[PDB]
């Protein structure tokens, strides 16, 4: 049988009242011919692409049609705490909440997802995620590929696992609190190994790793290169040619790839060095989508220059903030043990060479920052508004992967896990790798966040976040 076509999220713009309507609700989806309850925005699974423009404001009406509470966060968008949609941005079941977004950042591919306290991993796993396409005056002048769903296509890549009855098999337990929830099935915009018909010339892919815990590494089946033109927070100064592209949970990259007649190829993801993630079939390169060339000319360009990246400032005199990540050693031990018992040596492939004792031994608050599991009633500190700070984030103490994300900003990486960032990671980023080592980022917050609607800073391995590896901070 034929591969299904890649589903394309609708590209959503405001109405005459300058409103965008998002409904959060449950329905059914089909995976390998088996029905499953799933959640989506404006539909049964995943969500639309909200289109925003720099310098214009839009109002979003969000209707929660779930029977549990949720929140809606604009990952990558610089907005005040009150509309950031972190865990304090509760939307009651059957209620509505509206936010006005005053966009003021460069063009970029961002995304949106729930941030329900302690339940973000389950809510994303059940289906909730959407995209944000920000444009500005600079980017249209480049004449990049720009026909949505034809030569400019979003690619949201996510794994899931299912029970025998077909339902999504999500669990936040001792094992997943340590190593993450991951599965054996890969979805691309919700579909299993779809094909995308693309015109001859450049194809623009807006890649999102929407997995809870799985890191990815994109490449092509026939080794054609990817030309990275943008990261989380927008365009790079010039295209960076790569043969492979690691993408951490919650990160976005835009790339251009060449499409030539008569030569279909796959976008694939390569096995990664992360515990648990190389279990078959992820022990081998795994197809993401088939690109099917169409003998119609694509008009997009790959310009020699894209944008101007301002200089890093002098660092002397800037506030230096220390963020020590940690995992309770015993629950790290026990979760890794359960992983190894379940899958055996393969759960460490590619890596380098029972009674109740009460509330303090609970895995639900086992993961921490600066000695504290996330406390919604107590922002850890007050950061400055309109000033560059140096945040130092350490994972020394365990060997798990911690993609660290800071709300309210797009930052510059100074050191990524002990090394200067790769060139395609040297621009605007909202995530930095932390794994057994130390990262440092230069951050600036342009909007206020009060204690009642604080910004979060956290690991984006969702099961770590939900079991405490997050802090709140205020700005202004
Ligand atoms: Cu975010
Ligand atoms: Cu996020
Ligand atoms: Cu983590
Ligand atoms: Cu977040
Ligand atoms: O997040
Ligand atoms: O986020």
UniProtKB/Swiss-Prot annotation:
List of residues binding Cu cation 4: 402, 459, 464
Location relative to the cell: Periplasm
Practical applications according to UniProt: Triggering CueO activity at need by the addition of copper salts with minor toxic effects on E.coli cells could be used as a simple tool for biosynthetic purposes. The protein was also identified as robust host protein for use in biosensing and drug-screening applications.
pH effect summary: Optimum pH is 6.5 with 2,6-DMP as substrate. The pH dependence of the reaction as monitored by oxygen consumption shows a broad activity peak between pH 5 and 6 and a second activity peak at pH 8.
Resulting phenotype, residue 78 to F: Increases oxidase activity with ABTS as substrate
PROSITE patterns listed in its UniProt record: MULTICOPPER_OXIDASE2, TAT
Catalytic activity, EC: 1.16.3.4
Thermal behavior of activity: Optimum temperature is 55 degrees Celsius with 2,6-DMP as substrate.
Binding residues for Cu cation 3: 115, 407, 458
Gene induction: By CueR, in response to increasing copper concentrations.
Catalytic activity entry: 4 Cu(+) + O2 + 4 H(+) = 4 Cu(2+) + 2 H2O
Entry-linked CDD domains: CuRO_1_CueO_FtsP, CuRO_2_CueO_FtsP, CuRO_3_CueO_FtsP
Residues in Plastocyanin-like domain copies: 27-137, 199-264, 361-475
Positions annotated to bind Cu cation 1: 73, 405
PANTHER family: BILIRUBIN OXIDASE, CUPREDOXIN SUPERFAMILY PROTEIN
UniProt similarity note: Belongs to the multicopper oxidase family.
Protein name: Multicopper oxidase CueO
Organism (species): Escherichia coli (strain K12)
